[PDB]
Amino acid sequence: SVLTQPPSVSGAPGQRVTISCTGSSSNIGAGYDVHWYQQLPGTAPKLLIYGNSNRPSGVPDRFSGSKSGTSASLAITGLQAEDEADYYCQSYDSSLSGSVFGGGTKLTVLGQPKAAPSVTLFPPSSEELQANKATLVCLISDFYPGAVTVAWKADSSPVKAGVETTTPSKQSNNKYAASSYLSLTPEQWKSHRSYSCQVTHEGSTVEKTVAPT
Amino acid sequence: SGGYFWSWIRQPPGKGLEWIGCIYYSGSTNYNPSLKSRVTISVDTSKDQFSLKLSSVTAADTAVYYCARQLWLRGRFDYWGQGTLVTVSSASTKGPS
Amino acid sequence: VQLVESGAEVKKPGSSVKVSCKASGGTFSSYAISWVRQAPGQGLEWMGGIIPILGIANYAQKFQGRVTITADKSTSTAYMELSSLRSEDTAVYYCARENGYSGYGAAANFDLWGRGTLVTVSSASTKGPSVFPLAPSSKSTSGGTAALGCLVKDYFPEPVTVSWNSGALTSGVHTFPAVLQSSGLYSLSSVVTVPSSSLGTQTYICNVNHKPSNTKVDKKVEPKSCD
Amino acid sequence: NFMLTQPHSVSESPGKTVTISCTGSSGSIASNYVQWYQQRPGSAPTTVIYEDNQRPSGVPDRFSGSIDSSSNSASLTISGLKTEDEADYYCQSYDSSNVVFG
Amino acid sequence: KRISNCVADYSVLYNSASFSTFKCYGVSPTKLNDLCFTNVYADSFVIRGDEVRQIAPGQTGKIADYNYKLPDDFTGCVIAWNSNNLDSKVGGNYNYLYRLFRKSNLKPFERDISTEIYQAGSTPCNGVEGFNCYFPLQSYGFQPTNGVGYQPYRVVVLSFELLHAPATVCGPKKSTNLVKNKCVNFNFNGLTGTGV
C-alpha cells in the first residue's frame, strides 16, 4: 500500500547486507519511529528493535537500525543459519490512522544441488470405479529439489483439466516426495487405450504407462 | 481585486459603534442578529461601488453610517470613510419662520 | 509472559467466528491489546486495538463496522467476533501487546505476540471421508520391494493424521500433504516400503483418525488377483 | 449572545499610566482577535492597536495591549497621557460571522 | 502531517466563515501567504470547549503541559471550530482519550504515548487498580446535547519552519486584476513590455 519493499535481496555469508525501506512523508518521514520484525515461516514474529536506538533483551547486537530522514535502513554483519525469514517495516501512518506493515524481503541465494528422480504410476483399484469418479495418481519420490513439472497425456492429446501438483516435503533422509492426482470418471476411463504421467527434471524425462484392459 | 471585504458600521450620537453587516465582491453576505431580514447590500463592480438598503427604518435608526474596507474579515478595518449624518423624524420638509 | 491461543478453526462463508486470546500470569490488565493478521501472498495489516482499562474500541478506517472486539477483566481474556466472512479470510490472526514510551517518534511497538489462529473458510464443508486401498500388481513389482498404501479422498477439515497398524510401523512410512482443487477438495497419500516375502503372511491395514468429524474408518488391504 | 463589557467613563491625569478593560460574557477573550479603535468626536474612527499586541505604523508606542484569558478580559494600557488622546475607545470581536463591538 | 513539494493558497482557508475561533501569532495573519517558509507542520486532535483558551504560549494547565507543550518561540497558526454533529453521538461518545497524570514536564513538539500506570505513593503496584496508583489516561464526556463550553472542538495548529533551505511550500505570485486599453507595464515570462 503506502510502504514498498524489494522482493528479494542477495548476499554472501560474511559480508554486510543492508535493506532499504521507503515510504511517504506522513508516516516515516513525518518523524515517527520505525520497528522491524522477523517473520519466520512457522513461528510467531517477535520484536527485533524498537525506535532504532534501544536493544531489546535477547536480541544480538549484530542488528543495526538507522533512519536516514525519510528512508529507514537495517544493516547486518554475517549470514548465520536462521536468516531464512522475512523482514518488514512497521510505522504509524497518520493517513491510515493506524499501523501499516511493509512488503517483505526474502533472504536466500541457493541451497539445492541436483539429484535423480524416480516415479511410479498406480491405476485405481476395483472399489474406486463404483464411486462415479476416477482418481489417477502418479507418485514421484526420491528427488531433490522439489521442483518438478507434471504433464498428463492419453497417447493422443494432452490433458489440461484436473491436473494438480502438491508441494514436496522433506523426507527422513533429506529428500523430497510428491504426488499428482487427476480427477476423471470411469465412463471414459475404459474407452481410452492407456494413461500416463510425464515429468521433466533438469532435462531428464521418464515415462510410465498403465493399461486398464 | 485583492480579495478583501466590505462592511457597513453605524454609530448613534453618544453611543457605541454598531456592526450592520459584511459583504464580499461575490454574493457572500452576513448580517447582525439584531438586523436580520432588514439589511440588503449589493455590489456592482462596473460602477466600482457598493450600496446598502435598509427596510422598516424607525426613529431609533438615527446613527452615523461608515463604510470601511475590511482587509481581514475577523480583523480590524484598515480605513474608514467619513460618516454621513442620517436623521429619521417628522413627515414633511418645511421652511423656517 | 506468554499468550496462548486456540488452534485451527473452520466455518462456513457467512457465519461469525469466535476465538479467544488467553494470557498466562499477569501484566494483561494494564496495557493495550491489539490484533495482528498475516496473510500468505500479501503484507501484514492492523485491524485495531482495544484498551482493557476503559473498554474503548480503536479500529482503523480501512475496516468498516463489521468486526467487534470485547475485553474481560475477571479471567484476563479477550474475545474476537467477526461475521459475514468473505472468500479471502484464509489467514492467521495474532494477539499482540502495546508498550508505550516517551520520545519524539512515539510509535507503537509490538514486543509481545500471541501464538496464532489459523482461520480458513471455503466451500466443500465437512462430509464423510472416503478411503480407497491401493495394491501392487505383477508388473509393478520386479524385485524384492513392493509399494502399496491407502488413498484418502474428500476429507474436511485439516489436519488429518494417518496411522499404520496403530503405530506399529515406523520405518519406511511417508505422509503426503493436501492440495486445493477446483471444488476446494483436498487429497493426500500414504505409502510404505516392505519386502515382498511379508505380503502373504502379514496384513497391512490403514487407520484414519479424524477428530473434528469424529469418524474412524478401518479398511483392509488385499493384493490384486488378476495382476 | 456575546457582548463586550467596557468601562463607560475612565479619567486619569496626563503623564500617568491607565488601563482600559474589555470583558467578554460568553466566549473566551483569547478565542478571537480584539481590535481597539480611537475615535475623535466629529471624525471617523481609526485603528489604534490590533492582533492584541501589534501596533500600527504611525501611532506612538504607548498604545500597548494585553490579554488575560483567565478573566475573559482584554486590557489596553496607556502610558503618558496627552491632550490629543482624549477620544472614544471601542473594542471589537468577531465571534462566529457576527462582528461585535464594545 | 508534513507538507512538502506542494504549493497552496491560504485565502481559501479563511473565507469559509465557519470557524468559531482563529488565533495565529508570530506573523501578521494578512501577510503569511507572500512570506515563504521551508516546511509546514500540522497536527490534528480534539479538545473540549473550555480548553481552547489553553492553546497559547505562556501558561500552565492540565492538557497544554502533559500532551503538547507550546514553546516561547512559537510561530504557529491554530484553527479550531465546532463539528459536534459528526464526532459525537447519543449514548456517550468516549472514543477519544486524554492524558491527565504525568511524572514531570515534557519538551515541546514531543508526543507522549506511555500507557504506564502513574504511581502516587512510595510502593509498587505491578499494574493493579488499588491504592496509590491510578491510570493516567482517562475518557471524555462528549455529548451532543451539552452547552458550548464542553462540546467536541476540532483544533489544529499550522506551524512554520525556518532553516537553511530554499522555499518549498509557499504562496505563489497572486493573480492581480487584468487591465486593457491603457499604457501599462507587464511581463509574461519573457519580456518586461510596456504598452496597451
Residue numbers in the entry:
A (entry chain L): 2 to 214
B (entry chain M): 31 to 127
C (entry chain H): 2 to 228
D (entry chain K): 1 to 102
E (entry chain A): 356 to 551
What does the paper say about this structure?
During the first 3 years of the pandemic, the spike (S) protein on the virus surface has been actively undergoing antigenic drift generating a large number of variants. Being a highly dynamic protein, SARS-CoV-2 S-protein has been observed to adopt RBD “up” and “down” conformations. Our structural study reveals that interactions between the VL6-57-encoded mAbs and RBD are mainly mediated by germline gene encoded residues in HCDR3 and LCDR1, while germline gene encoded LCDR3 residues support HCDR3 in antigen binding. We provide evidence to suggest that the identified class of antibodies constitute a potential immune pressure driving the genesis of S371L/F-S373P-S375F mutations in Omicron variants.
Notably, H18 exhibits detectable cross-reactivities with RBDs of SARS-CoV-1, Bat CoV RaTG13, and Pangolin CoV GD1, with affinities ranging between 134–332 nM. When paired with other RBD-specific antibodies, binding of antibodies to cryptic epitopes may also result in spike inactivation by promoting S-trimer disassembly.
